[PDB]
């Protein structure tokens, strides 16, 4: 046969799905969650051989090892070991679309393992093998004998090896297909890899055993009482003497327990499940579970004889919580959630799709430290440990079926086909059977980007029928079809409608109130964080807080999917689509994370942290009103730090304990404050600090902040007069001005400040000229390509208007001597092919103190696309170690992405002023700056700026950060105005109008001086 | 107004005056206005205005200049938004064209007098032999703001000597969501903190 080319065959001899088992033979060990002697890991060194097709595999491999096999660590993705290349494709299938067929050239991974089995496991009960994840399909043999087959790369495949093993040494032979009919359901936007990429284990169960169990928690109206119901099923020798005992513990305390013989209630004319039993435990004043306080109990399920013999024990953590939608709101324990969520793929820059505890933990800590309380499993069931971690650390989870068929045309081609119903159903049903007892899972999802087919309707219903405790959501086909209990669009904007045909993406506020609509709305994806992005993020948070039914969303996405490459000198470097000779590919579309692949945050992370804060603040006079957005906890680990500074100089500060009830408010009156007299702006900054460490944070962690401008004292103080007047010297080619050890030179042919000397040292490498463009961001580029231009993208509009190639024509240049200064006046026009795009008029006023005041007025043609920025630039000769500024910071911040930044006096190393996004672009800006210090220079005004060793030109023409080369000197970009970065999506223009430079006329002013 | 500075310089082809004034109240600096006046051989007077507004003061109703012209002319001609009165938050219906009206049509006789008759988005204004150019909003009538704010019924207003000219770089919206609470939208409040405008006065 060819089972891997038949959607009708998804497994052969596979065991039923069930929640996590360990088959403990001692209840206290079960209780403690200690390891089980009956649950073995088979991870470690295996033998591996690559073939280009299954037909190339030699029959001997089954009976014995291949001389040429290599020894490799399992779990792993063979691509990671260099056997073949990982593929980075977005929507288009990595294979020819011709279901259910696959290429006859189908990379085949032959894995093997000689392992030992204790006689004891074989003297009784059952011994099975468990593959937590094999991509994409595989055959299994034990001791040369064929055991079975399995599909679905993201759920466990279990086989009974009882009859194949023998005492001692045994050998597994695993033939893994990279491609199978299952692939047609695995079209998620990620690296296309293969192999035994999750844990392999061996489990011993007794013949008479616990075959499944479901745990449910129902509450009274005020949640002061609950009933824990556990349905238990057994397999094997059914006898009257059998019983099940379920006990619930809170720590070492048993809070409840029940025992009952088997035989469930009568359910129909043929009777009931004589192999099932439902135990019901009453629990008074249960400690409730939530992402805010992950209160857990432990339930131990004992299978035993009535006379006391324990047969085996299974067990799980239990979170008492109720999830329901009522009156159009998603409620948790009776309260309406505000999902601070993130989509997270399982990705490691070295291991690829293999997950490990340390990584998971690291993601979880980072998520929590950044004010996220929820995660969506985009777009498949995760490694089992993930669930355990979200249960214990506390994060609401969206568990998603491994079904994505985006590459089809139309998108529901398969999901609307009954012949794919069987393959789909397995993906949904086995997920629920495995993960239904985890409190962290609060919503089931049907998969992703597969259109809307009747198969979805059927499976939606199956779930609602088997697990009434969790809503079911599904974005496909328009985000609000009959297969979703929640409206869960991807990239719908806050106020702007995008009325695509058939599946329009309405503004989220508008969506909620369409005629007859009542569901809650939670974006399954929003705020596309690709490269320099997350602009407009606060606009989402504001709507969510204001509209009850706008209950949040999940940012796309947590981590960049970059892979490590090594250079000629073996130095690692971040690779993306196409870096492995993979084609076609979607280049850098695989990197959309809030953090880099090594877990290092991108600057956008901080903007998410702040908008997702759990405390809101208002300032009234000297009173601060703190409002808690926690639903269930009191601010028992929080204090409030406040501080007032005058233009960066600290004046007063204090701490106040925070004591606010969930959804409550606390007023805080500040002490009489400083009344300065001295010019400057007074700013108040408050921070919420966690004095004690937690499971997910260190003492002193800051969970929230906010700033306000208090009184401002405008400087009315006139500067002292100068014992000097600058001298002007002229030539046909220049105007030269001198004042002391300082000189300025203006080129009369170009019209620009071409050189400056401090002492006798030249200060510039390139002249100071206006600049109206930027090395385009991923959002500026969208999907535009060399071969496939997207004319509507910003970058294309600017290229076509000639912005990047415009030449400044001098219209005027004059020099005038004043009473106590020299004034140079210039005007330039930027044109392209006959069109005047921009006009820049300026004045440079150098006076007896050595300062140069630059005044600029620019006009922009109304019919030209709004420019990326309006500013000046130049390459300074100097390379200083540090950058000191008075403005927003300390991190990179842009017009539509600066709420998190705080205004203060910041001081960083040069290098921190550059952001190493993998795909190079304009980066490192800091907005709202009033003074900038670098080497000998100081600049003052009201501007945004950037400074680094790389020219906009260089950034623009380089594709990968590791190819960047520092230039001589420092490139400085000082803008009066800069366009928003966008981010609502990364493939259509997304800069909100209010962040577009469309004024026509712009004015700015700077003073350049020295220190 | 407190003068902080007043200089004059001669340029090659022009004369340049520079001024700085602070506006204070009970020791607080509310606004600071920095100007330049460039008079050239063509007789045009170029005015440049840079204004600072303390952050903690309430956002001002407007940011412009004004004067009482000696002259009283029959018509008003401009190239801007019109023909009728219009304000920042109430200017969609107005069209950009060349309008010409009797001076009286430039005053709106609301029963309860107030600021009225503004036209925004004006690039050119003509009155008598005068001409102003730039990008501004304006009102022109025989009543000072002072008289209007002091008068409760339009029937008690009286034409002052000359013509009052109010030329604004920026003007606050008027609101109207309701009339018993602040209703001017944030995007219509003059809260930028620093304001720039420029105008050319000349004779026509
Ligand atoms: Mg198949
Ligand atoms: Mg025995
Ligand atoms: Mg997709
Ligand atoms: Mg007992
Ligand atoms: Na809400
Ligand atoms: Na992507
Ligand atoms: Na506290
Ligand atoms: Na680039
Ligand atoms: Na009045």
From Swiss-Prot, chain A:
GO cellular component, one term: beta-galactosidase complex
GO molecular function: alkali metal ion binding; beta-galactosidase activity; carbohydrate binding; identical protein binding; magnesium ion binding
Site annotation Important for ensuring that an appropriate proportion of lactose is converted to allolactose: residues: 987
Activity: how regulated: Inhibited by phenylethyl thio-beta-D-galactoside (PETG), isopropyl thio-beta-D-galactoside (IPTG), L-ribose, D-galactonolactone, lactose and 2-amino-D-galactose.
Active-site residues (renumbered): 449, 525
Gene Ontology BP term (one): lactose catabolic process
Impact after mutating residue 189 to F: Obliterates all binding and catalysis
Site-annotated residues for Transition state stabilizer: 345, 379
SMART domains xref list: Bgal_small_N
Disulphide-bridged cysteine pairs: none
Protein name listed in UniProt: Beta-galactosidase
Organism of provenance: Escherichia coli (strain K12)
Gene that produces this protein: lacZ
């Amino acid at each position: 046969r060819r089972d891997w080319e038949n959607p009708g065959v998804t497994q052969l001899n596979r065991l039923a799905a069930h929640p996590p088992f360990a088959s403990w033979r001692n209840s206290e060990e079960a209780r403690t969650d200690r390891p089980s002697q009956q649950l073995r890991s088979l991870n470690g060194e295996w033998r591996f051989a690559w073939f280009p097709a299954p037909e190339a595999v030699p029959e001997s491999w089954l009976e014995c090892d291949l001389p040429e096999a290599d020894t490799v660590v399992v779990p792993s993705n063979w691509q990671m070991h260099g056997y073949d290349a990982p593929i980075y494709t977005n929507v288009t299938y990595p294979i020819t679309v011709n279901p259910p067929f696959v290429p006859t050239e189908n990379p085949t991974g032959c894995y093997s393992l000689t392992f030992n089995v204790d006689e004891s496991w074989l003297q009784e009960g059952q011994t099975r093998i468990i593959f937590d994840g094999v991509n994409s399909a595989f055959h299994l043999w034990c001791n040369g004998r064929w055991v079975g087959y399995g599909q679905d790369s993201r759920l466990p495949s279990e086989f009974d090896l009882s009859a194949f093993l023998r005492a001692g040494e045994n050998r597994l032979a695993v033939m893994v297909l990279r491609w199978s009919d299952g692939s047609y359901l695995e079209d998620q936007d990620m690296w296309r890899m293969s192999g035994i990429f999750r844990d392999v284990s061996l489990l011993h169960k007794p013949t008479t055993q616990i075959s499944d169990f479901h745990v449910a928690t129902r509450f009274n109206d005020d949640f002061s009482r609950a009933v824990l119901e556990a349905e238990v099923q057994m397999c094997g020798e059914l006898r009257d003497y059998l019983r099940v005992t379920v006990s619930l513990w809170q720590g070492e305390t048993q809070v409840a327990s029940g025992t009952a013989p088997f035989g469930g209630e009568i359910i129909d004319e043929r009777g009931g499940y004589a192999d099932r039993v439902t135990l019901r435990l009453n629990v008074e004043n249960p400690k409730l579970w939530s992402a805010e306080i992950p209160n857990l109990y432990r339930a131990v399920v004992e299978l035993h004889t009535a006379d006391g013999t324990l047969i085996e024990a299974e067990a799980c953590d239990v979170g008492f919580r109720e999830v329901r939608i009522e009156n159009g709101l998603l409620l948790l324990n009776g309260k309406p959630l505000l999902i601070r969520g993130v989509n997270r793929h399982e990705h490691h820059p070295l291991h690829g799709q293999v997950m490990d505890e340390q990584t998971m933990v690291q993601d979880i800590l980072l998520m929590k430290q950044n004010n996220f309380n929820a995660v969506r499993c985009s777009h498949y069931p995760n490694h089992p440990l993930w669930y355990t971690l979200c249960d214990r650390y506390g994060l609401y989870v969206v568990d998603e079926a491994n079904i994505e068929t985006e590459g089809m045309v139309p998108m529901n081609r398969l999901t609307d086909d009954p012949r794919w119903l069987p393959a789909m159903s397995e993906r949904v049903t086995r997920m629920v059977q495995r993960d239904r007892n985890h409190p962290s899972v609060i919503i089931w999802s049907l998969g992703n980007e597969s259109g809307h087919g009747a198969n979805h309707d059927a499976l939606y219903r199956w779930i609602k029928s088997v697990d009434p405790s969790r809503p079911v959501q599904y974005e496909g086909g328009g985000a609000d079809t009959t297969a979703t209990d929640i409206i869960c669009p991807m990239y719908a904007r806050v106020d702007e409608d995008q009325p695509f045909p058939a599946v329009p993406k309405w503004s989220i506020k508008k969506w909620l109130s369409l005629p007859g609509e009542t569901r809650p709305l939670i974006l399954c994806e929003y705020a596309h964080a690709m490269g320099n992005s997350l602009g407009g993020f606060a606009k989402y948070w504001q709507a969510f807080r204001q509209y009850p039914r706008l209950q949040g969303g999940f940012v796309w996405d947590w981590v960049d999917q970059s892979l490590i490459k090594y250079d000629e000198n073996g130095n690692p470097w971040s690779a993306y689509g196409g870096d492995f000779g993979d084609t076609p590919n979607d280049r850098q579309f695989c990197m959309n994370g809030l953090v880099f692949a090594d877990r290092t945050p991108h600057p956008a992370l901080t903007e998410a942290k702040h908008q997702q804060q759990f405390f809101q603040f208002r300032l009234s006079g000297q009173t601060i009103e703190v409002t808690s957005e926690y639903l269930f906890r009191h601010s028992d680990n929080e204090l409030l730090h406040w501080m007032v500074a005058l233009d960066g100089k600290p004046l007063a500060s204090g701490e106040v304990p925070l004591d606010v009830a969930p959804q409550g408010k606390q007023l805080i009156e500040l002490p009489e404050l400083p009344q300065p007299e001295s010019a400057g702006q007074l700013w108040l900054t408050v921070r919420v600090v966690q004095p004690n460490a937690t499971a997910w944070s260190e003492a002193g962690h800051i969970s929230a902040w906010q700033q306000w401008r208090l009184a401002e004292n405008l400087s009315v103080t006139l500067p002292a007069a100068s014992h000097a007047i600058p001298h002007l010297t002229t030539s046909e080619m220049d105007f030269c001005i001198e004042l002391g050890n300082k000189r300025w030179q203006f080129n009369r042919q170009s019209g620009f400040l071409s050189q400056m000397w401090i002492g006798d040292k030249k200060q510039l490498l390139t002249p100071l000229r206006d600049q109206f463009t930027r090395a385009p961001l991923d959002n500026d580029i969208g999907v535009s390509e060399a071969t496939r231009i997207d004319p509507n993208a910003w970058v294309e509009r600017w290229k076509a208007a000639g912005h990047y190639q415009a030449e400044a024509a001098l219209l005027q240049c004059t020099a005038d001597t004043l009473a106590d200064a020299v004034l140079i006046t210039t005007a330039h026009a930027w044109q392209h092919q006959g069109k005047t795009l921009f006009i820049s008029r300026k004045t440079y006023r150098i006076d007896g103190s050595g300062q140069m005041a630059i005044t600029v007025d620019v006009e922009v043609a109304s019919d030209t696309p709004h420019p990326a920025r309006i500013g000046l630039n130049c390459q300074l000769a100097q390379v200083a170690e540090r950058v000191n500024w008075l403005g927003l910071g300390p991190q990179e911040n842009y017009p539509d992405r600066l709420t998190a930044a705080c205004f203060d006096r910041w001081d960083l190393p040069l290098s921190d002023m550059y952001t190493p996004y993998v795909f190079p672009s304009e980066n490192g800006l800091r907005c709202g700056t009033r003074e900038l210090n670098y080497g000998p220079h100081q600049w003052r005004g009201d501007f945004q700026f950037n400074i680094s060793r790389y020219s906009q030109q260089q950034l623009m023409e380089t594709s990968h950060r590791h190819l960047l080369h520092a230039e001589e000197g420092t490139w400085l970009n000082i803008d009066g105005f800069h366009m928003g970065i966008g981010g609502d999506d990364s493939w259509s223009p997304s800069v909100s109008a209010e962040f577009q430079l469309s004024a026509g006329r712009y004015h700015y002013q700077l003073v350049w001086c020295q220190k």
